Amino acid sequence: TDAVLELPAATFDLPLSLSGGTQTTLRAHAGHWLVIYFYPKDSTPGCTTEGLDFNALLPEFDKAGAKILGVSRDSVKSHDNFSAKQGFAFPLVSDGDEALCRAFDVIKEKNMYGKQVLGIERSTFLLSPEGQVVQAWRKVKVAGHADAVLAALKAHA
Ligand code: NA
Incomplete structure (x- = not known):
C-alpha cells in the first residue's frame, strides 16, 4: 500500500558497479533507508x-x-574522477547498461530533432529499510532538491 513504485524483483540483485571499484546491490542495503x-x-x-x-x-x-x-x-572511471574532484563521500553507481535506470523507469523520451530521443530524466527515490520505494521525484529541479529529499526522509523514517 505504501510503495509508489514496484520494481522488477531482479532489480534488487543487480550488481551495481560503484565508484571505487566495488559493487553493491539494492538488497545489500536492507535494514536502512536508501536514497537513490x-x-x-x-x-x-x-x-x-x-x-x-x-x-x-x-x-x-x-x-x-x-x-x-x-x-x-557514466563509467566507473568518470565516476571516480567526478567523485574525487567534488569530494563526494557517497558512492556513484556506474549504470552503464542502464539496467537500474530502466528498473526505475527514468529513461524518458522526448520528441526533438525530428527524432525520438531517450535520456536519463533526473529523478530520485526513497527506499525503505525493506526495499520499498516509498517516494519518488521525477523531472527533478536541482535547486532545493536534496533539502526536499532529506525532509521527506525525515518524515518517512
Ligand atoms: Na534499503
Missing part, C-alpha cells in the same frame, strides 16, 4: 550541484542511518 538519485551526466553543472548538495547534507542523512547512491550511466 539519478542524474544525467557526470561533471555537468546541474549534476555537480545536485551531488554537492547531497554531499553537504550527508551527516543529516547519517543521523537517520540512511545511505545515498547517485546513479548515471
Whole structure:
C-alpha cells in the first residue's frame, strides 16, 4: 500500500558497479533507508550541484542511518574522477547498461530533432529499510532538491 513504485524483483540483485571499484546491490542495503538519485551526466553543472548538495547534507542523512547512491550511466572511471574532484563521500553507481535506470523507469523520451530521443530524466527515490520505494521525484529541479529529499526522509523514517 505504501510503495509508489514496484520494481522488477531482479532489480534488487543487480550488481551495481560503484565508484571505487566495488559493487553493491539494492538488497545489500536492507535494514536502512536508501536514497537513490539519478542524474544525467557526470561533471555537468546541474549534476555537480545536485551531488554537492547531497554531499553537504550527508551527516543529516547519517543521523537517520540512511545511505545515498547517485546513479548515471557514466563509467566507473568518470565516476571516480567526478567523485574525487567534488569530494563526494557517497558512492556513484556506474549504470552503464542502464539496467537500474530502466528498473526505475527514468529513461524518458522526448520528441526533438525530428527524432525520438531517450535520456536519463533526473529523478530520485526513497527506499525503505525493506526495499520499498516509498517516494519518488521525477523531472527533478536541482535547486532545493536534496533539502526536499532529506525532509521527506525525515518524515518517512
Ligand atoms: Na534499503
